[PDB]
Write an enzyme that holds these catalytic residues in place. Structure first.
Site, PDB file in Angstrom:
ATOM      1  N   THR D   1       0.830  -1.196   0.000  1.00 52.09           N
ATOM      2  CA  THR D   1       0.000   0.000   0.000  1.00 52.09           C
ATOM      3  C   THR D   1       0.869   1.251   0.000  1.00 52.09           C
ATOM      4  OG1 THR D   1      -1.694   1.254   1.214  1.00 52.09           O
ATOM      5  CG2 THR D   1      -0.190  -0.121   2.516  1.00 52.09           C
ATOM      6  N   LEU D   2       2.096   1.115   0.500  1.00 52.59           N
ATOM      7  CA  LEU D   2       3.101   2.172   0.387  1.00 52.59           C
ATOM      8  C   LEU D   2       4.465   1.489   0.386  1.00 52.59           C
ATOM      9  CD1 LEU D   2       4.320   4.889   0.256  1.00 52.59           C
ATOM     10  CD2 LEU D   2       3.958   5.171   2.716  1.00 52.59           C
ATOM     11  N   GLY D   3       5.030   1.293  -0.798  1.00 48.55           N
ATOM     12  CA  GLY D   3       6.305   0.631  -0.914  1.00 48.55           C
ATOM     13  C   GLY D   3       6.143  -0.871  -0.980  1.00 48.55           C
ATOM     14  N   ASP D  59      -1.022  -6.241  -1.663  1.00 52.02           N
ATOM     15  CA  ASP D  59      -1.997  -5.620  -2.548  1.00 52.02           C
ATOM     16  C   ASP D  59      -2.643  -6.646  -3.465  1.00 52.02           C
ATOM     17  OD1 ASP D  59      -1.506  -2.922  -1.615  1.00 52.02           O
ATOM     18  OD2 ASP D  59       0.416  -3.075  -2.652  1.00 52.02           O
TER      19      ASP D  59
END
Lengths: 235, 233, 251, 234, 236, 242, 229, 242
Positions: D1-3, D59
């Protein structure tokens, strides 16, 4: 009766919702509309209403998508809300995805729009019944009652003198194998004439008629084309 | 209730909650406005108990803007709330247009907001009939009668309030086109208490010009009243 | 207006008839549930019978499913008697409070706080006219932090008294007498050496009360008991194999 | 979701004469550390469609839930065999969700591949979500879609994503012939996966080859054997 | 309303409020519109309550846009909000799409607001009857919006207190083919038969939307005089 | 749907009035009487304490003349229960004006604020009106001492002397007949006792009864209120001259 | 449309729904408050119940804060929701100002909540009357809150059934300089005479303020010594 | 009944809650639905008797047998719209469970959540209570099947076979003749036809390949929802008796 009628919430002591039974007969005042399902075509015809011999006939047949068309019968304002809902639904599906909306799924999506206006007491049941005629991969005809309900038919009729038109259709089983639309469009037009009152206006070039089929997107029947069909009806 | 249509169509087609609102105007005080070449005079009826109730109530003759009159007639309770919305509107317009609101625009808004309150849910129609005197975009005086139903129209010389029919039929037969500054005072006074007592304390009259709305003081008010009782003898 | 149909509007005598009518709705099911409190032991009984309602009664229902006894947490249990829908809705509200209390306060809810919190909602119904009382009166048992038993009963009218020998059903007018009388025998017996005798002093006491409150024979397949005594503190439904064991102590 | 801290690797999807053949290594690496070597990166979201994988595993696991429950909702509202969603339908649904996330700034780092048979001329109107001979598919009834994390979507005859978009893509672009047979497709895919073993750090043996034929979705776990080019001399 | 709400079906299938508002449109001044193949002509009675009124601020034939004009019947104050609403929607359309709105399309957005009270925000049905007309394309058009929401395109309609008489006269004297001037004299003759004693300038406010210029035109005191002088029906 | 259960509290009557306000005025015509008086020294408010019991504290409190601000105060006549709703509201209004404009709120502006909220309930909301109306006396440097009489309908009016409450007519009559325009503070206080005694048809007040307060601005707005002790002198003075 | 007042003015100008709520308060067990020179007494009689009930599990005299007690006479359900909401105000006040809330501001806050249900829509008025007593820096207090929302300052009061003659009994036996010990003696006697079938043990309740000591509820051991006379 | 039967949120003086028993007579005048357990799998049944005079519906279009998660059969008997609202809510709960737990929702809590959703509408002025009786069923291998019937106003009750609809009294008395828990599922199809032919009041008579439609969840369906193919219906139509 007098007490069990005021709101769309109270059940009659026989379990009947009067305020949706009453709106279910607003469709019984609209002019007749007939849908006939062939092996691979659907023919929809409806009688337009002229309130005066100066007024233009009211529009009965509406186009929803390439292969989806309807024929309302009830309160015109209520139907216009549903056509916009259906049009905005087939277009969104053709936008979010690249397919054609599943006609079975579209009818359910509009059949429960009737429903949400029945649980609450600040709303009323739609006074309009629809004739969702479409060819998705096979011809199919639907009908939605003012109470949340829908069915797949092989022929319909709406309201005015529908019992007269149904008798013509109920005794005709040819419609399944009735290829050669000429042979099928006459069957529907004869049905619409049956409901039409005698010693009154006859079926003229001011009665709606549209078709949809295998490689036939929803199209109106042009008056020049339609005019000769009425001639064979006189036979 | 909260969000229900209280004003609904009677079986004969009338709006009963508006028709009743009109009868609330009739139980009010009469107000009269007269137009002239470049000024308008407004005379109204006031009721004060003697020796008490100092005339600081100043119900009618309400300033809206630099040049905007308002002489309502009806429920004083709904008068303040309706007026204060216009004063709020008048400045907002003068903020979004950088030009003072014309008399026609204010009347259209008052007619709009009044008609809005007879169409929304769970709101009672205003029991007030107003009339606005002011100048349009071009400098041209005008008076705009209003009714609680929302209907509005410009009038040369109109009377509203309690028994306005008698005043209007009198005002219709002796209205000149361009009267004098002292004639308009007299016509307004002669008409306002044709239905009100002849005493000079009952009537409050003010005159509107291109600038600085002027209230007519009791000196000439008493003077013209003594010119009217002899007219009645 | 004459509408005493409202859930809240005081009648001219100061009473809320809807509260009385809702209580009458609980009595209509004629399901009797009895729970008694002993020394470091609490037991609760129900009837495992269909609530007296419109639907046809027992023909093919598996009677195992039909219970009036639920548990709120691993250590708190309840016996809701009333309309079946309301009883099912009451436990889910009850379960949420004991779950929310745990997350918000880091320890398990008391048996007395859970029912007080429940009553604080049943009051909201009583005072807002836009909704309707749950026709459900329940009995809650558990163990506090002092290893002491707790028994509490709430009513369709928000009222959370909390007894030490409680009865709910359609016979509470006279069941108050027998339960008071039958609980004095264990007071007249002053042996005071009952070491974890919930099995043979409390559970049998409660079954005797049910056999006396309603005069049937109490087949082991038409009753059920649940006990939250110390050394268990888990609200375990006592199996049928030993329920009829106490039913064989008619002697 | 981030990285993408827990990343997959390239997946290769080609269409042969009996349907789609999609292959993928079974390793997810924690950066420069092969934390897991038995995770699967090819999901079955329909009896006739499969879903690819690349980049962050969290993800793509979340995306699998969306596609899985989208299927069951279709299956509940399914009356005939033609009501089932095509692989193209899911592609246009994965494209939309990737795009919606792109207007926001939470793009769920992935390179999803959607493949399957876009037709109902081979009967499977008996659905067992919880557990003969192949047919010849005209290669126009087969869909192999691609979805970049910016929302870039397209379909082709051989979609290689992840890092095989530099090695396997060159081999396919000069070796993929129409109507390849069963074993000829595998020896072509095996040649593409072997190169990624030498030349990609975050790749491995122990491939999971999935084929989508007229009978459904299959599975098998080779242990493809890279050893060539004689660098041992010293 | 004694024990019923706005959304209530009568046991005959009709709504109660809309069938009550239909009786509220038979009180306004009579307006007559005629659609020929050269442009729509709109005529309207002018009911001056007193000579003190300015006769200008009160109006019956507003313009929805540069090519649309309408008549009114029923609650006059209740019709201004529709015309004001339609003005914003017509202009909003001209912004999103560079062209002018179809009169048929303009009527639909008015019709759907006429039942915004129904809740699929107003609270009661609008009690007016519009007579919209214009020359968008496909020649000039003339429509007619009811409180019930149904709208039927007309060739020559009439609204107001004496609309029953006006439609009786139009239904006989109307022919499909007329010049523009034949429509103008026809509209006045219909009004003359149903209006009051004097056919003066201050009694009617005829406005035209010619196909050629494609723009509404409010006839002034001069253009209105040359039509009265025709007197094609000197029958008393 | 509670349509059958509604009372339509915000609906016009056949004669153009509002029944809920009609009845609210009736409610405040049976409450205890309150007197307002403007003198040259200050403004006088005096109301009648309805008897409940001798066990009432009646030492440090009375529920008719409250404090709205240092320069404004009110005498309530009507439902005592919902007065405290409006008293707290007007207290908020008079303190938020001082928050914005950094000066005390003129009396004529507080009244229109507290009358707008009183009127708003009878305009829209489907709620019952405030069955309360109170004189709001205060001193403002712009227009000096003021006295305003409110209404459940929301329409107020400035006054020189008003006697709302039960038997107001017998107290307005005596006020109208004896309110000289220029009165001293002690003179006005005696008048307040005379109209309070005559309104409740008692020859002499009792001081376990009607209570009095005033402003009498001394460049500092002293705003004094009577404990019962100071009123015996007022009662003594009334007896000597009457 | 679902928020409209159910409490409306009757034609004779009375909030008739409130008059019904006061009818039920005038039929509950008599609560009683008395304040003395050095403390306040609130007392209520809890009718002699069956031995099945646990008497300590229900207490009509609850405690708001360190020095503020309370007692009610009405519907027990509404007391709990009001008492719980009253404790939030006593805590919310102390979260701003250091000191414990004082009775005058607490009563005004609570009375504003009882008034809300009188006016707001879809709800009924509270069917109970409260007696909030406490010790402040301004001495001792004893207030009463009606179902109507209006609150009164009292020196001694009754709220329960037959409080007409019950309060008349107190008038002839109360003086401002009454000793707190004598106050409890008079509080017991007035409850004793009103309670038909005098068995005033196990069916009474006392709460005391005690000259700025924390509010304490006398358990029954400390009550039987007050029943000699 | 004297005004207490108008709204669902009022209790009649005898305690019975009206406006819900009226629903019960609405479903009991509707098309019957059947569901019983065998030793291999649940078999359901819906006899669309009201749709016999129409003669225009497509042959096997109308269908009251719905499934969730492909292993839970849901059928109803009432208002075909109100029930269809619940199915979409039943599917929503199944989806919500899977988004959280990676597991198909266990049946015994699906019926609990649906029972609360149905019951939640019996608590308000405005909301109209649902007019559908819901039958939910599922079969497993380790644990045999089970049937719940969610009546209006909650009341989810576990059955071993239930009929809900117009003639549910004449169907139950015929089903309980045989212990179907030991009867195979293939030959139970024959048995239910004999009940439809007899216990149905001439609505269905020898032309019922279309009016009645049903499905099982049995071993031959791999314990997953499956409508019976027409090639198995006709062998079960060996109903030739007398």
């Amino acid at each position: 009766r007098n007490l069990y009628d005021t709101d769309n919430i109270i059940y009659s002591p026989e379990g009947r919702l009067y305020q949706v039974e009453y709106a279910s007969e607003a469709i019984k005042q609209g002019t007749c509309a007939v849908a006939i399902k062939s092996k691979d075509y659907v023919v929809v015809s409806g009688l337009k209403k002229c309130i005066s011999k100066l007024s233009f006939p009211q529009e009965k047949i509406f186009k929803i998508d390439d292969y989806i068309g309807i024929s309302m019968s009830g309160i015109t304002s209520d139907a216009k809300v549903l056509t916009k809902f259906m049009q905005n639904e087939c277009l969104s599906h053709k936008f979010l995805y690249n397919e054609n909306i599943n006609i079975e799924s579209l009818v359910r999506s509009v059949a429960d729009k009737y429903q949400k206006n029945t649980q609450k007491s600040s709303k009323r049941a739609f006074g309009v019944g629809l004739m969702i005629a479409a060819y998705h991969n096979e011809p199919c005809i639907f009908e939605t009652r003012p109470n949340g309900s829908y069915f797949e038919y092989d022929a319909l009729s709406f309201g005015a003198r529908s019992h007269a038109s149904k008798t013509y259709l109920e005794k005709n089983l040819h419609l399944f194998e009735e290829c050669s639309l000429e042979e099928l469009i006459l069957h529907c037009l004869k049905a619409l004439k049956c409901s039409l009152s005698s010693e009154s206006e006859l079926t003229i070039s001011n009665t709606a008629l549209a078709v949809v089929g295998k490689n036939h997107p929803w199209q109106e029947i042009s008056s020049l084309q339609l005019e000769e069909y009425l001639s064979k009806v006189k036979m | 209730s909260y969000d229900r249509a209280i004003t609904v169509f009677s079986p004969d087609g009338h709006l009963l909650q508006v028709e009743h609102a009109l009868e609330a105007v009739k139980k009010g005080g009469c107000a009269v406005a007269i137009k002239s070449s470049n000024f308008a005079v407004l005379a109204v009826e006031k009721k004060n108990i003697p020796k008490l109730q100092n005339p600081k109530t100043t119900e009618k003759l309400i300033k809206l803007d630099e040049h905007n009159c308002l002489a309502f007639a009806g429920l004083n309770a709904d008068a303040r709330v309706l007026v204060n919305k216009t004063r709020l509107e008048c400045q907002r317009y003068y903020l979004n247009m950088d030009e003072p609101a014309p008399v026609d625009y204010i009347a259209k808004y008052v007619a709009k907001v009044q008609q809005k309150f007879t169409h929304r849910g769970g709101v009672r129609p205003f029991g007030i009939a107003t009339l606005i005197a002011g100048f349009k975009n071009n400098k041209e005086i005008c008076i705009y009668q209003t009714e609680p139903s929302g209907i509005y129209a410009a009038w040369k010389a109109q009377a509203i309030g309690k028994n306005a029919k008698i005043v209007q039929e009198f005002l219709e037969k002796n209205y000149q086109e361009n009267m004098e500054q002292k004639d308009c005072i007299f016509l307004a006074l002669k008409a306002i208490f044709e239905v009100v007592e002849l005493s000079s304390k009952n009537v409050e009259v003010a005159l509107l010009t291109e600038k600085d709305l002027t209230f007519i003081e009791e000196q000439e008010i008493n003077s013209m009243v003594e010119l009217i009782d002899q007219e009645r003898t | 207006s004459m509408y005493d149909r409202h859930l809240t509007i005081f009648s001219p005598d100061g009473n809320l008839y809807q509260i009385e009518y809702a209580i009458k709705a609980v009595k209509n099911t004629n399901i009797t549930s009895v729970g008694v409190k002993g020394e470091n032991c609490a037991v609760i009984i129900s009837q495992k019978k269909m609530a007296t309602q419109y639907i046809s009664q027992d023909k093919l229902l598996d009677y195992n499913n039909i219970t009036n006894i639920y548990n709120i947490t691993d250590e708190i249990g309840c016996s809701m008697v009333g309309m079946p829908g309301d009883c099912l809705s009451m436990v889910y509200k009850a379960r949420s409070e004991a779950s929310e209390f745990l997350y918000s306060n880091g320890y398990n809810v008391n048996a007395e706080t859970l029912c007080r919190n429940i009553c604080d909602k049943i009051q909201v119904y009583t005072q807002h006219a836009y909704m309707r009382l749950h026709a459900c009166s329940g009995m809650i048992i558990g163990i506090d932090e002092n290893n002491k038993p707790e028994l509490f009963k709430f009513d369709p009218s928000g009222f959370c008294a909390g007894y030490r020998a409680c009865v709910i059903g359609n016979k509470e007018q006279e069941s108050i007498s027998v339960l008071e009388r039958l609980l004095e025998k264990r007071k007249k017996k002053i042996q005071q050496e009952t070491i974890d005798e919930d099995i043979r002093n409390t559970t049998i006491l409660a079954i005797e009360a049910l056999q006396t409150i309603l005069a049937f024979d109490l087949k082991a397949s038409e009753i059920e008991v649940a006990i939250v005594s110390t050394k268990n503190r888990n609200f375990t439904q006592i199996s049928e194999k030993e329920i009829d064991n106490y039913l064989t102590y008619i002697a | 979701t981030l990285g993408p801290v827990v990343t997959g690797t390239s997946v290769i999807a080609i269409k042969y004469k009996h349907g789609i053949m999609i292959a993928a290594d079974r390793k997810a690496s924690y950066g420069s550390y092969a934390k897991f070597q038995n995770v699967e990166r090819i999901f079955k979201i329909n009896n006739k469609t499969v879903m690819g994988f690349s980049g962050e595993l969290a993800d793509a696991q979340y995306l699998h839930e969306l596609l899985t429950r989208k299927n069951i909702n279709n299956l509940s509202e399914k009356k005939r065999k033609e009501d089932m969603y095509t692989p193209q339908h899911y592609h246009s649904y994965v494209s939309r969700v990737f795009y919606v996330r792109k207007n926001r700034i939470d793009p769920l780092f992935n390179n999803i591949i959607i493949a399957g048979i876009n037709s109902q001329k081979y009967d499977n109107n008996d659905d067992n979500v919880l557990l003969e001979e192949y047919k010849e598919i005209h290669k126009d009834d087969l869909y192999i879609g691609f979805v970049d994390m910016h929302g870039t979507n397209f379909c082709d005859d051989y979609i290689t994503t992840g890092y095989a978009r530099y090695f396997a893509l060159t081999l396919l672009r000069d070796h993929y012939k129409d109507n390849m047979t069963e074993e000829e497709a595998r020896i072509l895919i095996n040649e593409c996966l072997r190169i990624l073993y030498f030349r990609d750090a975050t790749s491995s043996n122990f491939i999971q080859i999935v084929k989508v034929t007229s009978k459904g979705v299959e599975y098998e776990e080779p242990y493809i054997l890279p050893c060539v080019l004689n660098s041992a001399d010293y | 309303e004694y024990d019923r709400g706005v959304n209530t079906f009568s046991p005959e299938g009709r709504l109660f409020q809309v069938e009550y508002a239909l009786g509220a449109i038979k009180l306004g001044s009579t307006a007559v519109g005629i659609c020929v193949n050269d442009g729509v002509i709109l005529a309207s009675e002018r009911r001056i309550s007193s000579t003190l009124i300015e006769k200008d601020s009160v109006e019956k034939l507003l313009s929805i846009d540069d090519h649309i004009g309408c008549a009114m019947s029923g609650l006059m104050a209740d019709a201004r909000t529709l015309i004001d609403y339609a003005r914003v929607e017509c202009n909003h359309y001209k912004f999103i799409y560079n062209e002018n709105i179809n009169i048929k399309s303009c009527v639909e957005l008015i019709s759907e607001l006429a039942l915004d009270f129904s809740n699929l925000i107003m609270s009661r049905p609008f009690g007016v009857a519009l007579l919209i007309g214009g020359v968008d394309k496909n020649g000039p058009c003339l429509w007619y919006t009811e409180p019930s929401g149904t709208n039927t395109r007309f060739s020559a309609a009439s609204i107001g207190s004496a609309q029953e008489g006006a439609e009786l006269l139009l239904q006989e004297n109307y022919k499909k083919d007329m010049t523009f001037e034949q429509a103008e004299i026809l509209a006045l003759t219909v009004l003359r038969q149903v209006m009051e004693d004097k056919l003066s300038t201050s009694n009617v406010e005829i406005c035209a939307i010619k196909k050629s210029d494609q723009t509404f035109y409010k006839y002034n005191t001069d253009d209105i005089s040359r039509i009265i002088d025709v007197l094609p029906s000197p029958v008393y | 749907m509670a349509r059958r259960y509604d009372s339509r509290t915000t609906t016009f009557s056949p004669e153009g009035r509002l029944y809920q306000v009609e009845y609210a005025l009736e409610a405040i015509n049976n409450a205890s009487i309150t007197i307002g008086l403007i003198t040259k020294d200050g403004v006088i408010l005096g109301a009648d304490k309805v008897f409940i019991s001798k066990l009432i504290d009646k030492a440090n409190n009375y529920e008719k003349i409250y404090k709205i601000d240092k320069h404004i105060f009110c005498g309530v006549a009507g439902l005592n229960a919902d007065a405290n709703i409006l008293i707290n509201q007007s207290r908020l209004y008079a303190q938020r004006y001082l928050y914005n404009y950094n000066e005390v709120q003129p009396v004529s502006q507080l009244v229109v604020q507290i009358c707008d909220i009183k009127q708003s309930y009878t305009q829209y909301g489907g709620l019952r009106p405030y069955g309360v109306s109170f004189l709001i006396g205060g001193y403002d440097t712009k227009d000096g001492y003021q006295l305003y009489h409110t209404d459940p309908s929301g329409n107020y009016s400035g006054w020189f002397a008003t006697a709302i409450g039960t038997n107001n007519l017998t107290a307005s009559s005596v006020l109208k007949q004896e309110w000289k325009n220029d009165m001293t503070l002690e003179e006005g206080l005696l008048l307040a006792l005379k109209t309070l005694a005559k309104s409740t048809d008692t020859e002499i007040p009792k001081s376990e009864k009607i209570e009095l307060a005033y402003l009498t601005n001394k460049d500092g707005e002293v705003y004094q209120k009577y404990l019962t002790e100071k009123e015996i002198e007022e009662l003594i003075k009334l007896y000597t001259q009457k | 449309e679902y928020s409209f007042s159910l409490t409306t003015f009757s034609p004779t100008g009375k909030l008739v729904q409130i008059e019904y709520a006061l009818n039920r308060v005038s039929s509950s067990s008599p609560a009683l408050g008395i304040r003395a020179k050095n403390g306040v007494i609130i007392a209520t009689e809890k009718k002699s119940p069956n031995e099945l009930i646990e008497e300590n599990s229900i207490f009509k005299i609850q405690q708001i804060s360190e020095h503020i007690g309370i007692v009610y006479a009405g519907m027990p359900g509404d007391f709990r929701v009001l008492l719980k909401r009253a404790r939030k105000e006593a805590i919310r006040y102390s979260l701003q100002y250091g000191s414990e809330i004082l009775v005058k501001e607490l009563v005004k806050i609570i009375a504003s909540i009882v008034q809300e249900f009188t006016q707001t829509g879809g709800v009924r008025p509270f069917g109970l009357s409260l007696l909030i007593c406490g010790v402040d820096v301004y001495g001792y207090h004893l207030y009463q809150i009606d179902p109507s929302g209006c609150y009164f300052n009292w020196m001694a009061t009754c709220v329960g059934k037959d409080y007409q003659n019950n309060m008349s009994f107190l008038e002839k036996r109360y003086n401002k300089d009454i000793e707190i010990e004598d106050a409890i003696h008079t509080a017991i006697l007035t409850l004793k005479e009103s309670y038909e079938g005098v068995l005033n043990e196990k069916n009474i309740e006392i709460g005391v303020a005690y000259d700025n000591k924390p509010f304490k509820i006398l358990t029954q051991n400390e009550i039987k010594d007050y029943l000699i006379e | 009944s004297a005004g207490y039967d108008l709204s669902v949120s009022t209790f009649s003086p005898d305690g019975r809650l009206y406006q819900v028993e009226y629903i019960y007579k609405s479903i009991n005048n509707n098309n019957t639905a059947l569901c019983l357990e065998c030793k291999d799998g649940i078999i359901c049944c819906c006899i669309n008797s009201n749709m016999d005079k129409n003669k225009m519906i497509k042959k096997n279009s109308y269908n009251r047998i719905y499934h969730v998660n492909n292993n839970i059969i849901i059928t109803y008997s009432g208002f075909d719209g109100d029930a269809r609202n619940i199915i979409d809510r039943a599917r929503s709960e199944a989806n919500t469970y899977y988004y959280n737990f990676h597991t198909n929702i266990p049946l015994h809590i699906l019926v609990n959540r649906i029972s609360l959703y149905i019951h939640a509408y019996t608590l308000y002025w405005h909301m109209r209570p649902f007019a559908a009786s819901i039958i939910i069923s599922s079969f497993n291998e380790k644990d045999k099947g089970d049937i719940y019937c969610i009546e209006p106003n909650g009341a989810c009750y576990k059955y071993s076979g239930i009929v809900i609809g117009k003639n549910k009294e004449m169907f139950k008395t015929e089903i309980e003749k045989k212990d179907y828990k030991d009867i195979n599922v293939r030959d139970a199809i024959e048995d239910i036809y004999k009940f439809i032919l007899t216990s149905d009041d001439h609505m269905n008579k020898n032309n019922l390949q279309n009016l009645v439609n049903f499905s099982w969840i049995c071993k031959e369906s791999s314990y997953e929802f499956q409508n019976i193919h027409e090639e198995i219906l006709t062998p079960a139509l060996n109903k030739a008796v007398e």
